């Protein structure tokens, strides 16, 4: 069958390096102008923290549980308008996405094995926040990386 619709309940994981404070930015394959932290749908049968862990593993091949890293629950949830040009992946009538925020500090920067994006960059947090098209991604970088 066709790829099932994305769910309008999602997670965001802001990955950064504790040592340099640079933020891991990833180039989307649907909109190559859209660089971002890790995002994805919370699927039926999983919780948001579980979705965050799965997506981090699937997208950037970092196993939070295996590395004994701390997946920080930001305890922030926002709602935003799905970008017009990306709405095609959601069910008919769906225009609003609800996103819950997490952060993940790696001890150092590392080379990244990415699977779903086109490219990655490690950027100073202001540069990262400035680059992303996502307002929520920007705000999460500002509040939980930059401070």
Coordinates of C-alpha atoms in Angstrom, one line a residue:
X1 CA 0.0 0.0 0.0
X2 CA 0.9 3.7 -0.1
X3 CA 2.9 5.0 2.8
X4 CA 0.4 5.5 5.6
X5 CA -0.4 9.1 6.7
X6 CA 1.9 10.8 9.1
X7 CA 0.2 11.4 12.5
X8 CA -0.4 15.0 13.5
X9 CA 1.0 14.2 17.0
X10 CA 4.8 14.4 16.9
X11 CA 8.1 14.8 18.8
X12 CA 11.1 17.0 18.4
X13 CA 14.6 16.0 19.8
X14 CA 17.1 18.8 19.9
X15 CA 20.4 17.0 19.7
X16 CA 23.5 19.0 20.7
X17 CA 27.1 18.6 22.0
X18 CA 27.6 19.4 25.6
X19 CA 31.3 20.3 25.0
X20 CA 31.0 22.7 22.1
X21 CA 27.2 23.6 22.5
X22 CA 26.8 23.1 18.7
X23 CA 23.5 21.8 17.5
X24 CA 23.0 18.9 15.1
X25 CA 21.1 20.2 12.0
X26 CA 19.8 17.8 9.4
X27 CA 18.8 18.5 5.8
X28 CA 15.3 17.1 4.9
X29 CA 14.8 15.1 1.7
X30 CA 11.2 16.4 1.0
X31 CA 12.2 20.1 1.4
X32 CA 16.0 20.4 1.0
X33 CA 15.8 24.0 2.2
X34 CA 14.4 22.8 5.6
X35 CA 17.2 22.0 8.1
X36 CA 16.1 20.7 11.5
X37 CA 16.7 18.7 14.6
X38 CA 15.1 15.2 14.7
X39 CA 11.3 15.0 14.3
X40 CA 8.7 12.3 13.8
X41 CA 5.2 11.0 14.4
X42 CA 4.1 9.4 17.7
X43 CA 2.7 6.1 16.3
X44 CA -0.3 4.2 17.6
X45 CA 0.9 2.1 20.6
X46 CA 3.9 4.2 21.6
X47 CA 4.4 7.1 23.9
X48 CA 6.2 10.4 23.1
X49 CA 9.4 9.5 24.9
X50 CA 9.4 6.1 23.0
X51 CA 8.8 7.8 19.7
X52 CA 11.7 10.2 20.5
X53 CA 14.0 7.3 21.1
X54 CA 13.0 5.4 18.0
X55 CA 13.3 8.4 15.7
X56 CA 16.8 9.3 17.1
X57 CA 17.8 5.7 16.4
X58 CA 16.1 5.6 13.0
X59 CA 17.3 9.0 11.7
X60 CA 20.8 9.5 13.2
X61 CA 21.7 6.0 14.4
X62 CA 22.1 7.0 18.0
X63 CA 20.8 4.5 20.5
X64 CA 20.0 6.6 23.7
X65 CA 19.3 3.5 25.8
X66 CA 22.5 1.7 24.6
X67 CA 24.7 4.8 25.1
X68 CA 23.1 5.5 28.5
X69 CA 22.5 9.1 27.5
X70 CA 19.8 11.3 29.1
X71 CA 16.8 12.0 26.9
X72 CA 15.6 15.2 28.5
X73 CA 11.8 15.7 28.5
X74 CA 11.4 19.5 28.1
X75 CA 7.8 19.2 29.3
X76 CA 6.8 21.6 26.5
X77 CA 4.2 20.9 23.9
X78 CA 3.3 23.3 21.1
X79 CA 0.8 23.3 18.2
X80 CA 1.7 24.6 14.7
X81 CA 0.4 24.9 11.1
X82 CA 1.7 22.1 8.9
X83 CA 3.7 23.6 6.1
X84 CA 1.4 23.8 3.0
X85 CA 3.9 22.0 0.8
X86 CA 4.3 19.1 3.3
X87 CA 0.7 18.6 4.2
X88 CA 0.2 15.9 1.5
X89 CA 1.6 13.3 3.9
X90 CA -1.2 13.8 6.4
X91 CA -4.8 12.6 6.4
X92 CA -7.4 14.7 4.5
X93 CA -8.4 17.8 6.5
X94 CA -5.3 17.6 8.8
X95 CA -3.6 21.0 9.1
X96 CA -2.4 21.3 12.7
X97 CA 0.5 19.3 14.2
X98 CA 1.1 19.0 18.0
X99 CA 4.7 18.6 18.9
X100 CA 6.4 17.6 22.2
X101 CA 10.0 18.7 22.9
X102 CA 13.0 16.7 24.1
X103 CA 16.7 17.4 24.1
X104 CA 19.7 15.2 23.9
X105 CA 23.2 16.2 24.8
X106 CA 26.0 14.1 23.4
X107 CA 29.3 14.4 25.3
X108 CA 31.1 15.5 22.1
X109 CA 30.3 16.2 18.5
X110 CA 30.5 13.1 16.3
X111 CA 30.3 12.1 12.7
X112 CA 26.7 11.2 12.1
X113 CA 25.3 8.3 10.1
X114 CA 22.0 9.7 8.8
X115 CA 19.5 7.6 7.0
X116 CA 16.5 9.8 6.0
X117 CA 18.1 13.2 5.5
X118 CA 20.4 14.5 2.8
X119 CA 23.2 15.9 5.0
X120 CA 24.1 17.2 8.4
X121 CA 25.9 20.1 10.0
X122 CA 27.1 20.9 13.5
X123 CA 26.3 24.6 14.0
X124 CA 26.6 27.1 16.9
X125 CA 23.1 27.3 18.4
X126 CA 22.2 30.8 17.2
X127 CA 23.2 29.8 13.7
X128 CA 21.1 26.6 14.0
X129 CA 18.1 28.5 15.3
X130 CA 18.5 31.0 12.5
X131 CA 18.8 28.3 9.8
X132 CA 15.7 26.2 10.6
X133 CA 12.4 27.0 8.9
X134 CA 10.5 25.6 11.9
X135 CA 9.6 28.2 14.5
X136 CA 9.2 25.5 17.2
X137 CA 12.6 24.0 16.4
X138 CA 14.1 27.5 16.6
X139 CA 12.4 28.2 20.0
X140 CA 13.5 24.9 21.4
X141 CA 17.1 25.6 20.5
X142 CA 16.9 29.0 22.1
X143 CA 15.3 27.9 25.3
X144 CA 17.1 24.6 25.9
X145 CA 20.5 24.9 24.3
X146 CA 21.3 28.7 24.2
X147 CA 19.2 29.5 27.3

